[PDB]
Structures are given as C-alpha cells and as structure tokens.
C-alpha cells in the first residue's frame, strides 16, 4: 500500500541559544529536517506533512523548495496534537510514518523494516536497546506484541531493568491514526496529548502493536543542544567514511574527513587527512587529494593530483592535471587535460587549455587561455577603472613573461610572445613578439647605508 510521512518540527530549540528554530541547524551541511524529508522521499512518501510552529518565517525561507505540506501548529499541546493537525490529509488506506525533525539520522533501511512489520489495522513501533534506559518508556512485550510503554516514574524494580525503550517513531494506517488521535487525552503531569498513548489505545481495540528494533541508537538520537548535534555529526561522518573505505576509497584518516553532500568516485582514489568534500563532487580513477583541501561542487578527471592546501569551487579539472599546493579555483574555473596550476595562483571564471601552465603568484580572471601556454609568475589579468569585468583572450602556444599585466578587454593571438614586466592594453597578433623597452639610471660606487 501507499505511504505518507509526518515530521514534527515545531520545536523552539531553546538550548541551542540560536535565532534559528531547532531543526534548521545542520548535519553535514544540510538542515536536520532536510535529512528527514530526504529519507521520507527515498521511502516513496506521496505526502510529507511538515508540522511547524517556532520560527515559521525562517522555516519557509530555508525550506522554500521542499515538496512538503506546511502544517502550522499554533500551540504545542503535545506530539499527538501535532500529528492530528495533519490527520485530515491522511488517506484511510495509506500507511503513515511519524518522524522527528530533530532526530535526523533515521535510515530508509530501518523505516522499511518498520513498515514491513506493521500488522493490518495495527502499529509498528520503533524501539531501541539502551545500556542505561533511565528516563525512557520501557517496552513491555506479552505474546510477542507491545502491551504497554511504561514510563520511568511508574515502572517497578523488574521493569526498570528492561533495556528496550520507545523512540516515538511509529507506522499505522491513516484511518487508525484518525480514530485513535481523537481519543488521546491530556490527563498527566504535563497536561499534554502524547502520541505514546496510541499503543494503549491500539490494545484497547484488540489491534496488534509490533516492536521493531533500530540498528543503532544514534539513528533515533535527538539533538537538544550543539554538543549533542556535534555527537550526531561525528557519528554521521564516521558512517560516511566507513562506507567510502569499504567502497575502495583510500581515506588516510576517517576521523579527519568530512563529506557534506555527495561523492561519486572511481577506483584507487586517495584522500589525505583534513580534506572537506562539499556539494556534488565527482572524482575520476586514481585521483589523489593532499592534506587540507576543500572541494565544493567540482568535477575531477582521472589521474589528477591535488597537492596540499588547495581550495576549489564550481570548477572542472581535466585528466592528468596537476593542482597545488596553495591553489585557488573559484567558480567557473575550467582546466583542460594535462594542465598545471601552482602555489599562490587564483583562477576565476576562466578556461585553461590543454597542457597550459600557471604555476606561480598569478591571478587569472574572466579569461580564455588556449592550449600549451606558459603563464609566467606574477602575471595578472586586470581591468580599467569603471570597467565591468571585460575578458582576456589568449590563443594557443602563447608565452606570457613574468610580472605582465593583461588589461582587459584584450586578445593575444596564437604563438605570441610577451616579455617580462609588460603592460598589455592592445591586441597582440599571431606570432607577435612584445617586449618592454626599459630606461634605467646606473650609478657606480653607490655605497649602501650599512
């Protein structure tokens, strides 16, 4: 049968001490709630009902593009009251999974096992074993089925030793949710309508409640502060790195590796310590990444070596190219195959042709460089004052001498040669040699003040 998801995300998150609502704080560069919405989407949810309240405006701006049904809960009357806000949109013959925006590491595989175990007209309750279950609702099984969730304050000596506890995550059909939520009361110390009470209501109706144990505790762990958030981040990062290592990526130290998006990789990829991968990154075969690199939204061809402390963003690098150390690729940098980018070099919105080298103390911006060019140390592409970034065009096999200024708009045709310390403001012809005529004063017997 069909499936829809409900995500609780109305929490203030007071203990984060932030202007952001609780669920917008990120895990691996992504808001906590976005992990949940994506997991719900990978399950095949027709609808994803997002229960929101605190920081409504911020939720809407940060999650504007999410395919969710925005359900405002004006008052936090309890988790059952929150689910009931979305209940008029539940299809009677569809399954509904209840998730929490601040417990983001819940897996598609655990939820699939939970949905699968759900008995007809009953509930599938997600449970977990804790070494210290103190404070949590103990799961009581009788004839294999969950008969009660016994709270810490109510449990007897024997029940206190039960390690299996309630996570709040559950699956039931829409009609059963509509029916039971209308029957939840708030007669307890907190005066709240608890979704927990649906287990007692199911048993009252002689409907079966089946327990499904989660793989890891960290999957159901919520973050109430930035310390807990950091623990979720380390667990998530270690999980991503282990999957990569088992896929054949040589990550020198999985404890000093960060993936904040997606990684597509070839075989024999080597990633040194303190590397950060952001957005959508694709590495070809035998790519080597040196210590301290940051790759954001990049495409790296086969056999590329990125030497230490290189920062690349919205760039493309061709096969056998050599980058770094200390290279900066800014958005629009397109390096063809067998290119060379060295230390203290900045490339921005420029194309660099096959075999070309830009190895030292250079700025290349809004330029087109052909194949087999030699861009000398200290070369800078610049503009006139009041200009609107006008473009530098360099053809094939051009030599640009050290410390030359290329003043855009300007073209340098194939095979041209530019001498060191030149100011290029006018177009250079095919095979034109341009050298600066220097005037110098020479004074003999100049005794230095030493």
């Amino acid at each position: 049968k069909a499936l829809s998801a409900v995500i609780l995300a109305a929490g203030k998150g007071t203990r984060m001490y932030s202007d952001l609502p609780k669920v917008l704080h990120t895990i691996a560069g992504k808001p906590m709630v976005k992990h949940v919405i994506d997991t719900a989407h990978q399950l095949g949810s027709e609808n994803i009902h997002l229960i929101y309240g605190h920081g409504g405006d911020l939720m809407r701006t940060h999650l504007a593009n999410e395919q969710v049904n925005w359900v405002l809960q004006t008052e936090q009357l309890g988790t059952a009251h929150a689910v009931q806000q979305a209940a008029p949109f539940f299809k009677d013959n569809e399954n509904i999974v209840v998730l929490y925006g601040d417990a983001p590491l819940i897996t598609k595989e655990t939820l699939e096992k939970l949905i699968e175990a759900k008995p007809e007209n009953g509930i599938a309750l997600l449970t977990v074993n804790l070494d210290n279950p103190t404070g949590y609702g103990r799961i009581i099984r009788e004839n294999g089925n969950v008969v009660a969730i016994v709270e810490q304050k109510d449990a007897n000596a024997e029940q206190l030793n039960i390690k299996e506890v309630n996570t709040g995550v559950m699956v039931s059909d829409g009609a059963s949710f509509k029916k039971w939520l209308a029957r939840v009361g708030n007669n307890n110390a907190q005066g709240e309508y608890y979704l927990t009470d649906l287990i007692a209501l199911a048993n009252q109706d002689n409907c079966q409640v089946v327990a499904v144990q989660a793989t890891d505790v960290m999957e159901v762990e919520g973050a109430n502060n930035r310390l807990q958030l950091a623990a979720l981040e380390r667990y998530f990062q270690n999980k991503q790195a282990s999957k990569l290592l088992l896929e054949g990526v040589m990550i020198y130290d999985p404890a000093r590796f960060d993936l904040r998006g997606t990684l597509e990789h070839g075989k024999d990829v080597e990633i040194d310590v303190n590397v950060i991968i952001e957005g959508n990154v694709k590495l070809g075969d035998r790519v080597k990444i040196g210590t301290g690199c940051v790759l954001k939204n990049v495409v790296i061809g086969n056999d590329v070596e990125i030497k230490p402390y290189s920062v690349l963003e919205d760039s493309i690098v061709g096969e056998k190219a050599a980058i770094g150390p200390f290279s900066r690729l800014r958005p629009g940098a397109e390096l063809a195959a067998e290119t060379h980018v060295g230390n203290f070099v900045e490339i921005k919105k420029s194309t660099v042709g096959k075999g070309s080298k830009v190895n030292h103390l250079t700025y290349v911006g809004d330029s087109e460089i052909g194949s087999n060019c030699n861009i000398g140390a200290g070369v800078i592409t610049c503009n006139y004052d009041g200009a609107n970034k006008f473009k530098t065009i360099i053809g094939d096999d051009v030599f640009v001498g050290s410390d030359t200024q290329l003043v855009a708009p300007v073209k340098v045709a194939n095979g041209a040669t530019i001498g060191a310390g030149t100011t290029i403001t006018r177009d250079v012809g095919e095979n034109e040699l341009v050298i600066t005529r220097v005037a110098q004063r020479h004074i003999q017997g100049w005794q230095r003040p030493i």
Copy 2:
C-alpha cells in the same frame, strides 16, 4: 575565614627530557603552574606560596609577573618538608590549600567544595575513585571520617579492593599545619617527610579528617612525561569545547578545536574544523570561521566571515568584513566595516577604511587606506633602501591599478586613480589620474622555439 595556597613546583621533571623544569611545560598555551596559580587566585587566596627548586632561574623569568611568594626548597626532603618551607608565613586563623604545579587541571569548584567541608581544627582531604587503584593510598573511612591512608605495600586483600584513593590535595588552618608539620618524621623506605602523615597526626590529636571526592580523575592527574601532558591537553580541550557548544557556539568538531586563552562570543557563531584560538579573542554575533584558521588576540565584529586558511594576530575586524581564504593579518591590522581581504594578501600595521577591497597577491604595510578604495592585485607598499618603514597614506575612493608599487613615504589623496604597473614615489593630488607611459618593441613573425 581567609585563605592562602601552597603550590609544590620544585620537581625536575626528568622524564620530560627537557631543559625546562617540570611545571613550565604548557597546557593550552599556559604553563602547568600558571593554571594552578590562576585557580588559587580565583578562590580568593591572600597569598600563594610557590615552592620552587629545580630550574629556579627559568621559573623566575617565565613567571616574573605572578603575584606569588617565591619559596626556595634547596633539597627535596619530601612534600611535608616543602609545605613547611612556607609554614612561617601561614596565618594561624586562615585556611591553607595544598596544590601541585604538575597537576594543573584542578577546578575552583572542586576546591570550593573541599574548603567548605573542612571541619574546624581538622582536615579536608581531596579523594578520587579509580577503576584500578593499584599503587595509590587507599582511603579508610570509620564513622564517616578518614582514619588512615593505607599504602599499596601495606594493604590487606580487602583494603586492596578499595577504589577511593588519596590525591595529596588537602585544606587545614595555618596553626594546625605549623603544629603537625613539625611532627612529621621520615622513617619509611624513601626516607622522606610525607604530607600524607598529617592524616595520622590529625587522628592522633582527635581532629577530624573529612574526605571530598573530586568530579573527574583528570582534575587530580599529574603529568610526569609529555605523553601524560598530551592526555591532560586533550581532556582540557574537550572540556573547553563542550562548554562552548553548551553556550551555543557551533563547533563542527570539538575533537579538532583548540582554545589557548579566552573566547568571548556572540550568538550563532560557527567554527569549522582545525581552528586554533590563541590569547584574548572576541567574536561578535554570527561570525563564521572556515577550516584551518588561526586567530590570536583578535577582535571580530558581527557578521564577519573568515574563509579557510587565514592567519590573524593583534588585529581588529569590523562588522560584515570578508576575510580569506589564505589571508594574513599581522599585528596592527585594522579592518573597518564591510571591507574585503582576499587570497595571498598580507596586511601589517595598517588601517583599511569602510568598503575597501584588497583581494589578491598584495602586501600592505605601515599604511592608512581610506574608505571605498580598490587595491588591485599585485599592489605592494615598499620603502627605499636604508629607510625606517616610512608610511603610505591613501585617502578615500582611490583606485590603485594592478601591480603598482607605492614607495613610502607617499600620500595619495581622495578620488585619485592609478593605472596598472605604476611606480608611485611622489604624492598624488585629489582626483589626479596617474598612468605609466610604456615603450614597447613589437616584432612581427616571431616564430617561438617550438
């Protein structure tokens, strides 16, 4: 009643294999003994008696500014002999706390609980539970009070299983210290006068010895080598990062964060992995720090973003400024609000006015730059040979073309425009345009040697 502290710091620290005495090795950029002196100061100690011996000269130069009473112990005759060196300066009606220069993580909160529990004319002994208490003096309690500290070699089978052990940290009044220290003998295998013996002496006098358990084992842990020192450092760093995370600082990875001084922060501050904070650092609201940054004695206004691999020292940064990646702020760098400092840029002892940009491959030293200036790539402020760093003055709304040399002493007035590749040695007037007249040799049909 009043309080004074005694700190034992006469140890050679042979196993550190250093020319430094034991207590001068640092934890979080601060000598071990300095943590103890600061803790003693935060308690409200009138006097802090520093027992020193080994590396006396080095102790005096490294701790010249400390408000302590320098007490030389010429021979290490034991911990009781060391305390007795300071005993003539103990006030009879003041409390005395005994601390160790090589056990630096002892907290003010633990010591406050220790002082509070001290019975009149008695001792408050600091204790700790160990999973493996092997080698340590077992605490024997009878009617709630400490009757003996039983050494490993003397303990019976039942006593060997006692997990509560002696830390050496204790509080008593000055008159009781004077009285008991004069009664300590050295009749034992080591021939030393042990401060431990004061517990047996207190009981002999029918004075009460009360045990106070420490929060963590690491608080009372001593460092005898650099491996143990490193373990204290990791524990201390993790403790600082957790406090920050609970205060609302987003530290991406607390295991890759280092605070070596003090941090003052606003709300919604984000600190990426491998960031080092040194000296006195103040961050405004929503400051973002990219991976690999080093901030030493800096003030950062609200909404500043520091991009990866930026190194800042003795600098001030105004609100909404953008720094890095690969920026270097040296002492005296003052960036006004909404400024821009980019890759491979070095700023030293210079002021940079509101909205001004210095985005590439530039050195700015001993300069004053006004508001809304554009400092082109490759611009360098320099001096003549034999000069004494003479100062560059740039007014408001100045354009400085790429690869220009500003030869100090020199002034460039408001609205001036300097063309690329210029050598400025003479003052530039308000709205003066200065461009280089270039001479070039152009040779057609120059076939490159390829």
Copy 3:
C-alpha cells in the same frame, strides 16, 4: 643459529577494489609487505622468501630494490602449499619464521621472543587473546605445550570460551618444515593445504609446540579492506607518536600527527596539530613546527621556527632561520643560518646566504643568494622563452627592490642596489645602483566613474 623468513603475499585483495595487489597498499607511506620485509631484515634473516602470485608485475616494479627471493605460487592451494614453494631453499640447521604481507605491524621484539621460545626440533607458535575469539582457532594447552588448534566449527561449549587463538605466525627449523609440509593434506571443507596442520604433525612426531602470546592484537591483525587498513594506520600512528612523546617531543595532539618515514630529533622540539613528517626528517634542538606543516626529506637546524601552513621538501634549513607562514620550500632549497622566508614565497633549487630575507610574494628559482640580502616583495627570478633554466647569481649585501624581475642568466655583485619595479637582464657591478627611469602621464581633475 641462523634465521630466514618466509612472507606470504600472493593474495588478490578483492575487497580493496583496487588494481593493486593486497600487500602494496601502504601503511605510513610504506607498502604493507615492506614493513614485514624490514622487520624480517632487523631480525637478521639471511634470506627473505617472498611468496607472490596476484599482480606479479606490479609487485616486481614496486619492490624492485628489495633483497628478497621472488617465489611465484601459480595457484593458491593453501598457506602450507605457499611455504612449501620456498622450502627447497631452507637450510636444515637454520630457523624459519612465517609472516604475512597483509599483517604488517608485527614487531621485531615479539618475533625475537617467539624465536627464543622455540624448542629444538619443535615449533614456536604465535598466539593472541581475543575478547571475542569467534571464528578463530582455539589454542589447547596440555602440560604447557600446544596439543591442538581447534577450529570454530569443531569446538565444544568449553573450548568456545577459550580466548587464546592462533595467528598463523610460527618458527621452526628448515628440516622440520621440509618434513612436515610434505605430509600436509587438503581433506577439509576448503580443499586447502593449511600451514595450521603442522601443529598436529609436530605432536604426531612427539615434537614440542610452545605458545608465545603477542603484546597487542593489532600486531597480528590483517587488513582485508581499506577500513581495516585505516584502523592499522591509526594504531601505527598512535604508537609512533607515543614513542616520540616519551622521547621528549612535544606533540600537541598525537591524534593529529603523522610520521611516514623516520624522525631524528633534538631536545625541546614542539610539533603543533596537523603536521605531516615524510621520508627522512631531522630536527635540531628547540625546533618549533606550527599547525598544518608538511616536512618531506628535510634537515632543520637548531632553534628554527616553522610558522603555520609551510610545505618543505628535499631542503636544508640552517639554525635560527624563520620560515612561514605559507612558505613553500621545493627540492634543492638551502637556507643558511638566521635566514627569513615569509608568506606566499616559493624557493626552488636555490641557496640563500646567512641573514638574507625573502619575506613576501616572491619566486626564487635556480638562484644563488649571498649573505645579508634583502629580497623585496613581488621579486621574481625568470627566464627568456626557449631557455633551459639558466641561473641567477646574487652576491652579498644586495638590496632588490619590490616587484623586480631578475632575468636569468644574470649576476648581481656584492653591495648592489636595485630600485623597485626594475627589469634586470644585464649583470650588475659591485656597488652598482640600478633604478628605473619612469615616464608618467598626470591628468588633473579626473573625476572617477562613481
């Protein structure tokens, strides 16, 4: 008696998902098998028989210089079949130790204890205790001697609780290996000739099998995938850092330190977080290394400070020199005593004389710089097009003004002074002052387009 070693290294290593055979994947910059060959060499092995099969060509190219006897096993018929391939080369009266190319952390000290315990005409079997010994061959001792290795599938309830397990590492004389290997059968579920069977064969001959327990489990741990390889790497790195810390090296964080070769050090050396040491590195006394540095095949004299994010390779640095932050030393960089190399500076195959400073945005390549020179910001050594890296010679006490281009081949004699923004193509005489005569157009009342 004499000793020879046999190393099993014929494995495909399918779960690494690599084009490399299993044993060539590195630990601390060295192939797994190379650690084993080096350990075997430090024991005093006359011969090291390398059993190889999978990726034969790659094994031979990567280990071309190893003093081993290359033994091809065309089919993996079992570990006993592999050892038997080398058995015709075993001396009857020499000891033979059996090692595994994919279990690289085995120590010389453990193997020495194993050889020592070997009874005449018997076997010394290396064993280890596991908390969970599930799947491993349980060691059965009777009268102190190993009577059987009981496999998981065969063990009774009582035997399943035995924590002591077989590692596969063993020592026996050559004649006993020849005799027993010829008697190993393949009658088991896998149809393989197991070296394990030699224990049962030894007992059949009334020869004694003595168990020797390894120091750590990690010493005998094999790597079947890159995740396991990463765990071996972390254990190895932590082991190297602890030895260094106990030797007196101040490593700020041993969890963020990497040694991939050898380190020779003086006293009071300080190494900050995220430092990588590669090849053969020698540090003098009181060397300080800032965060993020990479030192490969370097020699660093006493009292040198390397400031953050500096990358050095095949270089020599004299005493009291100051390097970084953001410095790049490329192969052949030789810095004399009391030199200064600053941010965004690249030195390649050049000598830099005593007291000389190269502090900003500079490239120095194929140069000889004398003593007490001042190399201004933006200075670049370059060549003509079609040149073959021709060399720049700078004498003593030379001032080179900011943004000067030194066009090789060229000499600048003692005491010469070069003004800022100069192009040097011709030799400069002793005490010659060379300054650029500039031509400039000055336009008054130039209103900027703002």
